[PDB]
Amino acid sequence: STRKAVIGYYFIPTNQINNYTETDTSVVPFPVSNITPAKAKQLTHINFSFLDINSNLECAWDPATNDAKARDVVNRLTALKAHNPSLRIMFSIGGWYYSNDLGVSHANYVNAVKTPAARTKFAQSCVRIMKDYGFDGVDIDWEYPQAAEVDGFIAALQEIRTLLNQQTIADGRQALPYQLTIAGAGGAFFLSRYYSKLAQIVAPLDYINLMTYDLAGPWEKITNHQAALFGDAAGPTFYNALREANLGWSWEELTRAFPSPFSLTVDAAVQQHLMMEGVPSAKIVMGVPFYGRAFKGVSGGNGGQYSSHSTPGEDPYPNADYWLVGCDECVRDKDPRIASYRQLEQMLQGNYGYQRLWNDKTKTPYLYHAQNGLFVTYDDAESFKYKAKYIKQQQLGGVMFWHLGQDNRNGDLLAALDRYFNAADYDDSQLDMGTGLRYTGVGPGNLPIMTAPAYVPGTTYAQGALVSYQGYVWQTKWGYITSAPGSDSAWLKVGRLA
Ligand SMILES: C#CCO[C@@H]1[C@@H](C)[C@H](OC(=O)NCCCNC(=N)NC(=O)NC)[C@@H](C)C(=O)O[C@H](CC)[C@@](C)(O)[C@@H]2OC(C)(C)O[C@H]([C@@H]2C)[C@H](C)C[C@@]1(C)O
Ligand SMILES: C#CCO[C@@H]1[C@@H](C)[C@H](OC(=O)NCCCNC(=N)NC(=O)NC)[C@@H](C)C(=O)O[C@H](CC)[C@@](C)(O)[C@@H]2OC(C)(C)O[C@H]([C@@H]2C)[C@H](C)C[C@@]1(C)O
Ligand SMILES: O=[P-]([O-])[O-]
Ligand code: NA
Numbered sequence: 001s002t003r004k005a006v007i008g009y010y011f012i013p014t015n016q017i018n019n020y021t022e023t024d025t026s027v028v029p030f031p032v033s034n035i036t037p038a039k040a041k042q043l044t045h046i047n048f049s050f051l052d053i054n055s056n057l058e059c060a061w062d063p064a065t066n067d068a069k070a071r072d073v074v075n076r077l078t079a080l081k082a083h084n085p086s087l088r089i090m091f092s093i094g095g096w097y098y099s100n101d102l103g104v105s106h107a108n109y110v111n112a113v114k115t116p117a118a119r120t121k122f123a124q125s126c127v128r129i130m131k132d133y134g135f136d137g138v139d140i141d142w143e144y145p146q147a148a149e150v151d152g153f154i155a156a157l158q159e160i161r162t163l164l165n166q167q168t169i170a171d172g173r174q175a176l177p178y179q180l181t182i183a184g185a186g187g188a189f190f191l192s193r194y195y196s197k198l199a200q201i202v203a204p205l206d207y208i209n210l211m212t213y214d215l216a217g218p219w220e221k222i223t224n225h226q227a228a229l230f231g232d233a234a235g236p237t238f239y240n241a242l243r244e245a246n247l248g249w250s251w252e253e254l255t256r257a258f259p260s261p262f263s264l265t266v267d268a269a270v271q272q273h274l275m276m277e278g279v280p281s282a283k284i285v286m287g288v289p290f291y292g293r294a295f296k297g298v299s300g301g302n303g304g305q306y307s308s309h310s311t312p313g314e315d316p317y318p319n320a321d322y323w324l325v326g327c328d329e330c331v332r333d334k335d336p337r338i339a340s341y342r343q344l345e346q347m348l349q350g351n352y353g354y355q356r357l358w359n360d361k362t363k364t365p366y367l368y369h370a371q372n373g374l375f376v377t378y379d380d381a382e383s384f385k386y387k388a389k390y391i392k393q394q395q396l397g398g399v400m401f402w403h404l405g406q407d408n409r410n411g412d413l414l415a416a417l418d419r420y421f422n423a424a425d426y427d428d429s430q431l432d433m434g435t436g437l438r439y440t441g442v443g444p445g446n447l448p449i450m451t452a453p454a455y456v457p458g459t460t461y462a463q464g465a466l467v468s469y470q471g472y473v474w475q476t477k478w479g480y481i482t483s484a485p486g487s488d489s490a491w492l493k494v495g496r497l498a
Contacts (some may be wrong), residue, residue, distance in 0.1 A: 003044065003086070003421075003422070003468070004283075004392075004397070004398035004399065004422075005042075005044045005045060005207060005284060005397050005398030005400070006042060006043050006044050006045070006399055006414070006417055006418060006421070007044060007045040007047060007090075007181075007207070007209060007277075007397070007399070007400040007401070008043055008045070008046055008047070008400070008401050008403065008404045008414065009046075009047045009048075009049050009092065009400075009401065009402045009403040009404060010032075010047065010048050010049065010404050010405070011014075011044050011049045011050065011402075011403050011404075011405065012028070012030070012073065012154060013062050014062040014065050014317055014481075017065055017066065017069050017073055018036075018064070018065065018066045018069055019069075019071050020072065027121050029405065030404070030405035031410040032073060032076040032077055032080075033076070034405075034409075035077075035080060035404065036411075036436055037080075037083040038411070039411045039414060040080040040081075040083040040084050040087060040155030041083055041084045041087075041416070041418075042350075042411070042415060043084070044086055044087065044398070044419070045087070045088045045089075045090055045179075045181075046080075046087070046088070046089050046090065046135075046398075046404070046453035047078060047090045047091070047092045047139050047181075048074065048077060048089060048090065048091045048092065048135065048210075049091070049092040049093055049095060049141070049403075050093070050095040050097075050141070051091055051093045051129065052093065052094070052098045052099060052108070052457065053093060053094075053105060053108040053112050053122065054099075054105070054108060054344070055108055055120060057091055057108060057111050057112040057118050057122055058112075058121060058122060058420075059122065059125040059126045059128075059129050059340075060125070060129075060222065061129075061156055064187045068357055070133070071133060074133045074134060074135070075091070075114065075134065077089045077456065078134045078135075078136075079391065083419050085176070086176070087375060088136035088137055088176065088179060089134070089135055089136050090135060090136060090137045090138065090139045090179065090181065091129070091133070091135045091137075091138065091139065092140070092141050092183070093126070093138070093139070093140050093141065093142075094109070094140060094141040094142045094183075095141050095143070096143050099141070099142045099143050100143050100175070101146075102218065104308050106318065108390050109142050109145070109149075110145075110149055111432050112156070113145070113149060113152035113153050113155065113156040114149075114152050114256065118121045118190060118394065119152065119155050119159050120159065121157045122163040122276075123156060123159040123160045123163050124163065126138050126160055126163075127160065127163040127164060127167055129427065130164075130167070130178070131167065132381065133162045134417065136176065136178060136179065137164070137178050137180060137181070137182075137206075138156070138160060138179075138180050138181075139180075139182065139183065139209075140180075140181075140182045140183070140188040140417075141182065141183035142186075142450055143183070143184075143190070143211075144185055144190050144193050144194070145193065145194060147179055147193070149203075149371055150193065151197070153194070153201070154197060154200045154201055154204075155197050155203065155323060157180065157182070157204040157205065157229065158203075158204050159279060160204070161180050161204035161205075162470050164177075164178040164179070164180055165177075165178075170472065173176065175346045179206040180204060180205050180206060181205055181206055181208065181209055181210055181285075181491065182201070182205060182209065182482045183211055183287075184201075184208040184209060184210050184211065184273075185210070185211060185213075185256065185269075186210045186211040186212035186213065186214075186215065186266070186269045186287060187214075187215050187268075187269060187462055188238070188240055188241045188242050188262075188264070188268070189238075189241050190270070190273065191241075191242065191269065192241040192242050192244070193271060194465045195242055195245045195247075195248045195272075195276075198244045198273065198276045198278075198279055199276055199277060199278030199279055201324045201394060202278070202279050202280075202283055203278070205283060206283065207283050207284075207285045207397050207398070207400075208273070208283055208284060208285065208401035209285040209287055210269050210270065210273070210284065210285060210286060210287050210400075211287045211402075212227060212266040212269050212270070212288070213226055213287055213288060213289035213337065213379075213402070214226055214289070214293070215228070215264045216264075216293065216441065217226060217293055217313075217438050218293075218295065218309075218311040218312060218313040218337060219280075219313045220236070220310070221236070221305060222236055222306050222307055222308055222309070223295045223298055223305060223306060223307050223309050223329045223377070224236055224264075224305070224306060225288060225305075225333075225362050225364050225366065225377045226292075226293050226377045226378075227266060227288060227289055227360065227364060227377070227383075228263070228264075228265045228279055228359075228361075228362035228363075228364055228380055228434025228436075229265060229266050229267055229362060229363040229364065229383070229386050229387060229390065229436065230263075230265055230266075230361060230362060230392065230433075230434065230437055230438060231262075231265050231267075231268075231362070231436050231437030231438075231439075232263070232305075232307075232359060232361040232362065232436060232437070233361075233437060234302070234306060235263065235305065235306050235362075236264075236306060237260055237261035237263055237264075237426040238261055238262060238263075238264050238414045239260055239264060240258040240259060240260035240261065240262045241341065242257070242261055242272060243255075243257075243258035249430075249470035250320045252477055252492050253443075253492070256441065256442055256443075257275055257441045257442060259439070259440065259441060259442060262410070262439065263364070263437050263439070265436075265437075265439065266286060267390070267438060267439050268392075268439040270286065270390075270394060270396065271438075271439040271441055271446070272439070272441065272498075274394070274408045274445055274446045275443030275444070275445050275446050276443060276444070276445045277398075277442055277443070277444040277445040278440070278445065279313065279445055281394055281395040281396055281397075282395065282396070283397055283402045283464065284394075284396045285396065285397045285398045285399060286387060286390070286391055286396055286398075286400070286418075287398050287399075287400045287401065287402065288379050288384065288387060288399055288400070288401045289346070289378065289379055289401070289402060290340065290341050290379070290401050290402065290403060290404075290406035290407050290413055291338050291339060291340050291402070291403075291406050292339050292340075292341070292344050292367070292376045292378030293337065293338060293339060293372065293376065293377050293378070293410060294307040294311070294324045294327075294336060294337055294338065294339060294374060294375070295307075295309055295376070296311050296323050296324075296336070296372070296373065296374055297309045297310025297311065297373055298372060298373045298374065298375045299371075299373065299417075301334025303355075303357045303366065303368040303375070304368040304369075304373070304374065304375030305359065305366065306326070306392060307375065309375070311337060312337075316335070316422065317334060317335040317336070317337065319462050320334070321336070322334070322335075322336045323336050323374070324336035324337075324339060324347075324374065324376075325347070325352045325353060325354075325369060325372060325374070326346065326347035326350050326352035326354075327339050327343055327347060328346075329342075329343045330342070330343075333447070339378075339381045340406035340407075341375070341378060341379070341380065341406050341407060341413055342404070342406055342407060342408045342410060342434065343410055344376065344378055347367070348367065352369070353369050353370070353372070354367040354369050354374075354376075355367070355368050355369075356422060360383075360434055360436075361436035361437070361457060361460070362433065362436055363377060363383055363386040363387075363433070363434060363436065364377070364378075364381065364383045365378060365379070365380050365383060366378070380413070381412060381413060381416035382476065384413065384416050384417055384420060384427060384488050385431055386431065386434075387399070388417065388420035388421060388428070389420070389428045389431050389450040389498055390433070391421075392421075392428075398421075399417050399421075401414075402461065413472075415469045424498060442494075447472070447493065447494070447495055448494075448495050448496070449495065449497070449498070450466075450468075450469065450473040450495025450496065450497070451497070452466035452467055452468045452474075452495075453466075453467060453468065453475070454467065454468050454469065455467035455468065455469040455474070455483070455484065455485055457482075458482065460479070460481070460482055461476045461479060461480060461481045461482070462476065462479040462480060462481040463476055463477070463479040465479070466477075466484060466494070466495075467482075468497055469485040469486070470485070470486065471496065471497055472485070472486075472493050472494075472495060472496055473493075473494055473495030473496070473497065474491040474492065474493055474494065475491065475492045475494045476490055476491060477489075477490055477491070477492055
C-alpha cells in the first residue's frame, strides 16, 4: 500500500536557464510548462539538475548562471506542487560531466568530503541552497567516489541528513520531510568502489537510485542491451569485480554471492544491493533510461545484438558524420550515439529502415537497421511492464529515470510507469517474466527462508548436510563435521528459519 517513488530528472543547461523561455523550442526545447498537471501527478520527485561543487568546496550553481533566471525556473517547478501534494522538487549535485574521475570539478568533490571541517562547510551549503531556492531535498550524483573518498562521502551524507532533519523540524515539514538521495552505480565495476560500505552509504538516504542503464555503450567490445532486466546466455558476460571487494568474507561466501562471469543486468545490480545486510529493499530504486544508445558498423545475424561495431567512443564526437538515420536531435546535438525515446519513436515511424525487435530473455526492445548496420538499445512501455512487475515483486522503493525531456510529447513512458504501479484496472498477475538468467547470488542480506532438521550434538555430518540451529539453516562445507554450526569455519549459513 505504500506508493512507489517515480523520480524523474529535469535537466536544463546554463545557457538555456540564462535565456529561459516557454515559447521557443529552438532556445529551450523542454521548458517547465511541458510538465503538465497530469505529468506532475504521475511523479513523486523531480530531480532538478545539475548543480556543482566549486573550488570553495561548497554546493553552487554554475558561476555563469543568471541567478534571477535560475530562481524563476526553479519557482516554476515548485509551483507544480499545487497539483500534487506528494511531489518533491529535489536538486541534484554532480552528474558525469562535473564529477567523473577526469571531470572538470572532480577535485572539489574529493576535497569537499575529505575532512570534518570541509564536510561541515559543504553540508551547510547544500541545505542553504535547498532553502534559498525552495527545493525539497538533495540528491548527490558523484560518479563515483572511490577508495579513501568513501569514508569521507559517508560522513558527508550523515551530516547532510542531520541538517535536513533540523530543517524539517524548523519548517514543520513532517508531512513531506526534506529528503536525501544519491544516484548509485548500477553495474558492478563502479559499484565495487564503495560496495563494502554499502549499508553505511544507504543508511542516511531515503532512496539510492540505481543507475541501471548505460550498461552498454561504445566503450564495450560488442553491442549489448544497456538495461537488460535479465540475462541472455548468447550475450556477453563480465568479471564480477565485487568478489575482489574488501569484505573479509571466505572463499565459499564470496563464491556464493558473486558468480563470475556474470550477466550485466538490472536484476544483477538490484540483487547485489539486496545481498548486503542493512540495505532495505524499500530504499532501492530502479533507474531506467528514457534514451537509446546507438551503435554503427554492426553485423547481421542476430539483429545487431552482440556484434563487433565501429562506434567512436571519444568525447566530443570526432567528426560530422551523423549516421543515426532519421535522428534530427543528433544533428542538433552533433552526436549520433544517443537518442531520446521521443526521437526513437519518430525514427521508427518514418521510412528510415529500422525494425523494432524484442529480446524475450532481457525483456527489452532494440532497433536494427539491416541496411546500414545499426543497433539501438533502449526501453519502452513494454519493457517497463516487466521492470514494474520486478519492482513490485522485489519490494523496491520505486523507479527513477533519466530524463523527463526525453519522454515523448504526450509523456507516454511516465504514464506507463504510473499506470503499472497505480492503475486499479491494470493487471500484471499473468505477465510472464521469462527464462532469462537471474543473478543467483546470496549474501547475508538476502538469505532464503529454509527448513532443515535440527542440529544434534554428536552426529557426524557429511559434506553438503543441512541442519537448523539458532535461527538459521547451515550447510557443512566438507565432512565429517560434529561442531555446533557457527562455532568454526566448517559450516556455511545458507538460510533463515521462519
Ligand atoms: C547524467 C548525465 C550525463 O551528462 C550529460 C552528458 C554528459 C551526456 O551524457 C549522456 O547523456 N549520457 C547518458 C546518460 C548517462 N547518465 C549518467 N551518467 N548519470 C545519470 O544518469 N545520472 C542521474 C552526453 C551525451 C552529452 O550530451 O555531452 C554533451 C555533448 C553532446 C556535453 C558534454 O557537451 C553536455 O552538453 C549538455 C547537453 C549541455 O549537457 C552538459 C554537457 C556540457 C551536461 C553538464 C551533461 C549532460 C547532462 O548533458
Ligand atoms: C574501450 C575502452 C577502455 O577505456 C576505458 C573505459 C572506456 C572502460 O572500457 C572498458 O574497460 N571496456 C570493456 C571492459 C569492461 N567493461 C565494463 N567495465 N563495462 C561496464 O562497466 N559497463 C557499464 C569502461 C569500463 C568505462 O569505464 O567507460 C566509462 C563510462 C562507463 C568512460 C568511457 O566514461 C570512462 O570513464 C573513466 C572511468 C573516467 O575513464 C575514462 C572514460 C571517460 C577513460 C578515458 C577510459 C578508460 C581507460 O577508463
Ligand atoms: O541524421 P538524419 O538522417 O536526420
Ligand atoms: Na522503413
